[PDB]
Design a protein around this ligand. Sequence first.
Ligand SMILES: Nc1ncnc2c1ncn2[C@@H]1O[C@H](COP(=O)(O)OP(=O)(O)O)[C@@H](O)[C@H]1O
Length: 1263
Amino acid sequence: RLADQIVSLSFNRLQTLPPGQKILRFWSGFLFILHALSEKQIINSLRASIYFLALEHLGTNSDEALAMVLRALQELMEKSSKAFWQALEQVPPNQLVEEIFKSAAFRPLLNKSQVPALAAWMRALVRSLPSTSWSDLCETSLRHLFETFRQSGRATCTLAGLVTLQQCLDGFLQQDSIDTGTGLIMVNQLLNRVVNYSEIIIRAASLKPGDIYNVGISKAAMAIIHSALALDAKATEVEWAALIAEKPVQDRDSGALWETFLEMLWAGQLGHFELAKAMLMATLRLRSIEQFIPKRKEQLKRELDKFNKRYQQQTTAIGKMLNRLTDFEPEVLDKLCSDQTIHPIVSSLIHGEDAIREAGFQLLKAITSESQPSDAVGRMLEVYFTPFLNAFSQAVDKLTATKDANSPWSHMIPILKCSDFVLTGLCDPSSGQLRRKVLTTEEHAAVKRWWECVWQAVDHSFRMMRIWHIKIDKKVMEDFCRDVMELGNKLLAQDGVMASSLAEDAISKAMREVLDPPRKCSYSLADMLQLRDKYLVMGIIETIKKLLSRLQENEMNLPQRTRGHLDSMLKKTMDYLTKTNLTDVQRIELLKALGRLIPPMDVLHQAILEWDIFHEGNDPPNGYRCGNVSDTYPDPYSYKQTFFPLLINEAWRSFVTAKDETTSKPFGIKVLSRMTVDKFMEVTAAVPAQISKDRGLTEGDIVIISKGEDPLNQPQELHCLSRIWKTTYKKDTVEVVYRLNAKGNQILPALTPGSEFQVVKITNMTTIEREYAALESLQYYDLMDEILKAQPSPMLTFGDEAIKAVMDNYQLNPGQARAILNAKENDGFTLIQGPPGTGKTKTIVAMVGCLLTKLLVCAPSNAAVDELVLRLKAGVKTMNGTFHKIEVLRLGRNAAVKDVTLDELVKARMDRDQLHKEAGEIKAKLAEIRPQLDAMKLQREFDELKRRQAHIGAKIDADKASGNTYARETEIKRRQIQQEILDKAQVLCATLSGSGHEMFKNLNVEFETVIIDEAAQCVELSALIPLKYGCNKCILVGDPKQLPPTVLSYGYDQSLFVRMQKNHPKDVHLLDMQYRMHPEISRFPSKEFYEGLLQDGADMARLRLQPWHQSVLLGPYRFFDVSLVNEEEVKVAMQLYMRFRSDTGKIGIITPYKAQLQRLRQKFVERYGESITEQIEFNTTDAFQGRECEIIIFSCVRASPTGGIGFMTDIRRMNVGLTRARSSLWILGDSRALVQGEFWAKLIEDAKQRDRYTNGNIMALLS
Ligand SMILES: Nc1ncnc2c1ncn2[C@@H]1O[C@H](COP(=O)(O)OP(=O)(O)O)[C@@H](O)[C@H]1O
């Protein structure tokens, strides 16, 4: 019946067009039957033609009938397409579409046509066909919809053509793999059809929404643009991943395709936010693809060159895309960043291609408006903490996961720079985000993930050097290795911040999770010590030592492969298994730290900073008792146990004595970041430049902290001590990181960001730290037994002709020649003891001419060093009568010494606008072009003027980054200039503390013989400093006296000389003569100090005859009787000098205290001008040691109390001040404030019992 009605309606039998009512009735019946039937039943029964009769009936002249055959054919091909294309294999889809579309009744179906039926019909048509027939159909069908048929019908066919292109692009974009054979060329044909039909898509997407002709045109065109821009990137990625594996591809235009949809519009259209997001994910699709670099011996192939040109065009277009995005307003920009669209921007920051990286860094600068890269990254970490710290970790981790020969290289240079940017935006001690806020659950994970990511990137950069060294130059690899080493150092320097931010119990828990990423990058570190570079080995050694010390501190282990590689490298097995160029210092340093150096100083800081300075006792508040000197310590550790409280007590007495006479003004600090980092309450502040320059704020400088208005005399307030820990010279204001003590700090509740304090300074730790270093590293000296047992070299006697022979060489004495010859003969410690006028410095100078026929000569004050330098420079005579001249060097920091100073000798051998003009000029063109814009020709200019502003701004930032290269190469020249100077010099002179500098560990020095002058006027741990450098012969010369017998029999500072003198007094070269002092100036401090044994020189009364002693009041000796100021002595000294002037280098005025020294200098400079600063030497007793003048004016303030702080030092002060003159000594002071002291009372009694007293009004008595 169905076939009989088909035969009735067939054009084969009837040979005529049937009436349209029968046609529509028949196809409505077919629709009812097909709704009743099933697809499997259609394939089984209906397929076994009705389809050909449908094609014949599709040519009727009725609009309704043509609509029913179209709806029918849609239902047939949708319900089962396999039978549809099996039963119609004779007719192609081309002829199907042409036969349907050439019908004369189809035009009013279009005209009389919430999508229309034809759009869904063509969706079913495209989905019903295989991929291989997609292209040829399109070559008709789109050409028939867009062009041949071209207004509701025109809008309908335009919508239809957009639907075809969208359906084909979505079909190709949803595939799991595009094959390299026919698949790539049909994708290429579709993309060429998209490029050809681009203008119609542009006018389609430019339509206004809500229009009567917009039936879905704009959304379809937008989806077409999105899918085309995704498919271009996917095709390029597929082609790259094919030709990098040496596979056949085939023998497109991505730049033009990106450029067309760029140049359509981006501001001033609907959905520009969505277009920008789609373009950003499209450029995220291809973020780890790099151009091809040929090998050194090989050449580039043809296909790789063609791919390089194509990739050049594509990356230029992508860079123009990213540069165009910096015209949006900040509101939509921060909406785009905050909102999965930040990942392409952050990945563009890393990229190795120049255009994409420059465009991304400009976009990052434009979003936050912080016009600097590190400031931009800091502001991004401030606003978007977890999105940015996740995007950076993902973008870096995506590229450092595989180590092969196809690994990218140009991406590894700007990974380190961005890691440095994040680190100095995250851990700065004033602008650090980790010093300001507490961390929640998500931020902890973000910071942890960034830590693991950056250490993995450093490990990947170090590991694959060998596979990279076959295709690049030598200089880029050397500079790359140096940069990676410096980044590793900067990364490992900041682990305490992570431990005390990512958490006393949880501190160790957080620290244990910080040191796990550095353990992975350990074998890579212990492989770069084999190179022939001299700068890299220093940094690798430092990083290995710091990592191993921190790992052994917190209780863990090193990887076994790193230890095995280090073990098979520095041990003899007789040669080494791996040839190195290491020295003998690095080998010892490693072979130790692994299992003569500088120890840590972190318990000393807490022991001195847990103190209250206003304690009224004579002992420290903590438990530190002393008074035990056993003189025969047979062990270094018992020596350490004895001499550590002997160091703490000395520091306490120095602190109190410096609190008495501080002479420093206070300054105010404001807290910038409070944080319990590295166990101490490390507070930071920004001190102005003028205060830091005026007060000399260096590291190791000790200050007070108080809330009081005058922190030196308010003990009732809230206060503590601090040590300056790190000083950084910023632009103007110095950044100072004070360290505190959070174990009883009274200001600790009052500590708050924004709390202005008042701070005054006391002393420096440098000598105490050097004494600690000498105490701890005494265990590796070569003079162990002589230091511990206090045994000098034995005494022995010479013949009576060589003594006269050496006496007749330097014109010496029988006391000063036997010592010369004995110290020439034997080795070890030789002791020479004399009062302050014998000639001990004269003996030492003749020793140098005796020994040199290099040397280190040391003295505990600077004045004795200056005297030794001048005497050793003036003239040297050998042991033949010959006048030679040796080379002199000063290892310190006077006028004549300034020409032989090591700091001056090293320094003497040592001695942007174009880019700024381009950036200012290029910014002027952007202002004119943008206001003129708000068309095609203009947009090419505004895209090419703005790329040079990206290019110049990259060159401006690269100018600042080049300063690190100039700063490093300055340092290797300094270590080589220093080492040359240290070998040309014949004699070298320094202080006891200055010779133990930290800079002599990395240099090559060996001083086999040390000479110490004034060895008995210093603490015992000071003379143990310049003995580390292989010294095996030391000569100790000094003065074991300067204390009276009632005071000689404290114990915290005696000497090294005094212990040996009390242990072995039989072998000490005594010098009993004197050769400067008049018999009065030699007769009173004799009987006070030297028990009538200091005998005067031959006929010295006649030698000391200068006129002035013609007056009894102005003789060689006369005592004058008049809060460490005492202006009365200032007026009396002024009157005495005025009297002597009324009646060059021979007049000196001496005060024992710094405040009266300041008053003396102020008053004298006042009315006697500035010429008396050099005429009369104004210095204390601590700056006048070892020297002499003809006339001296001594003015002491007042006697310290007997049981109080001081006393011993004031007695030593008085005895230094008394015996500095050769002709005249004039002592001043009042009687009432001086009779409290015992020895001043003995002095004033000796003054009366020999007519040496002047009392009453001196000012009337002088006139
Ligand atoms: N044998 C000598 N003959 C002549 N003068 C001497 C002799 N020995 C020392 N002097 C003088 O004695 C003074 C001692 O000064 P110096 O040696 O610098 O201090 P000290 O004796 O404390 O080491 C020198 O000025 C020197 O001129």
